[PDB]
Amino acid sequence: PLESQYQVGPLLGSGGFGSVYSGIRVSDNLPVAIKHVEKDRISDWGELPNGTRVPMEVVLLKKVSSGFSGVIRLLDWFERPDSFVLILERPEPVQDLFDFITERGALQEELARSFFWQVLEAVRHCHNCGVLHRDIKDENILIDLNRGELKLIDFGSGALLKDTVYTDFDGTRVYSPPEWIRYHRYHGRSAAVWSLGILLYDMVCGDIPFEHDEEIIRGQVFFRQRVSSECQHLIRWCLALRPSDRPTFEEIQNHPWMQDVLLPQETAEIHLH
Numbered sequence: 001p002l003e004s005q006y007q008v009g010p011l012l013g014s015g016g017f018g019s020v021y022s023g024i025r026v027s028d029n030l031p032v033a034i035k036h037v038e039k040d041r042i043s044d045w046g047e048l049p050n051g052t053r054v055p056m057e058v059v060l061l062k063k064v065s066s067g068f069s070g071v072i073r074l075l076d077w078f079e080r081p082d083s084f085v086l087i088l089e090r091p092e093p094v095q096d097l098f099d100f101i102t103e104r105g106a107l108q109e110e111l112a113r114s115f116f117w118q119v120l121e122a123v124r125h126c127h128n129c130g131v132l133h134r135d136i137k138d139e140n141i142l143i144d145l146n147r148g149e150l151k152l153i154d155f156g157s158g159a160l161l162k163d164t165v166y167t168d169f170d171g172t173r174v175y176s177p178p179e180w181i182r183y184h185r186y187h188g189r190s191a192a193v194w195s196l197g198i199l200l201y202d203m204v205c206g207d208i209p210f211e212h213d214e215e216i217i218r219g220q221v222f223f224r225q226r227v228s229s230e231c232q233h234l235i236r237w238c239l240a241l242r243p244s245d246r247p248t249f250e251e252i253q254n255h256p257w258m259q260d261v262l263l264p265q266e267t268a269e270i271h272l273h
């Protein structure tokens, strides 16, 4: 069913998420990505409406699939004896945000604003559909270079959204909030907002602000590049030590630094083409 329906191209990469290949759907030459995960390497399992036992990423990707382009679309999936295989959308040309920032260094604020705004819209969409990503970072964001549209990827560390405390975490440590480091406890929205402050810092400074646990706990933000006061303030707000002092998604998008955002296509014409 899958071996014949998709033509397998080169390996795009591999890691904690499994192995992802470039590929093409034979019926219409639609570009795709083919993601393989071994059953033994999945800790977090979930359950579909009908009760089949699948990797959580499949539950979460199904809950967020719709016309909205901010989250990578799950096109199909398959069970094999020892693995799951996910077929996912692939923009062409595409570049992940980690490589994009590596190549350019610190991004101009106008570009960081457009990118960050699109990440916010996408995270809001996930939260509305009951999904917490738990691994928001540059490596998990793709840029559709022609259209200037960002997409969230890798829901393999995700969870169903809930209002009670989380005591498990399997995302990236340096994007994880101080309450996780000190107490192994966090709540969904406020932890997500912390990762977003790390992401925004990363965009405007060209690197993440904290390496060591002690720096995270201390939460002192030092700017290594010229960054406007408004952007610094928003960043420091997202990285408040107390979870309850962090802004809501709404407060982030109504922040003065976030006004007059470019459209995705305007963003591509000025900054990407």
Ligand SMILES: Nc1nnc(-c2ccc3[nH]cc(-c4cccc(NC5CCCC5)n4)c3c2)s1
Pocket (backbone or CB within 6 Å): 012, 013, 014, 017, 020, 032, 033, 035, 072, 088, 089, 090, 091, 094, 095, 096, 142, 153, 154, 155
């Ligand atoms: N960890 C990951 N989980 N899903 C991934 C994913 C999903 C759908 C995708 N469509 C296109 C890509 C893609 C395109 C170009 C580079 C790229 N790099 C990823 C970085 C880890 C390996 C793949 N991914 C893609 C990646 S990467």
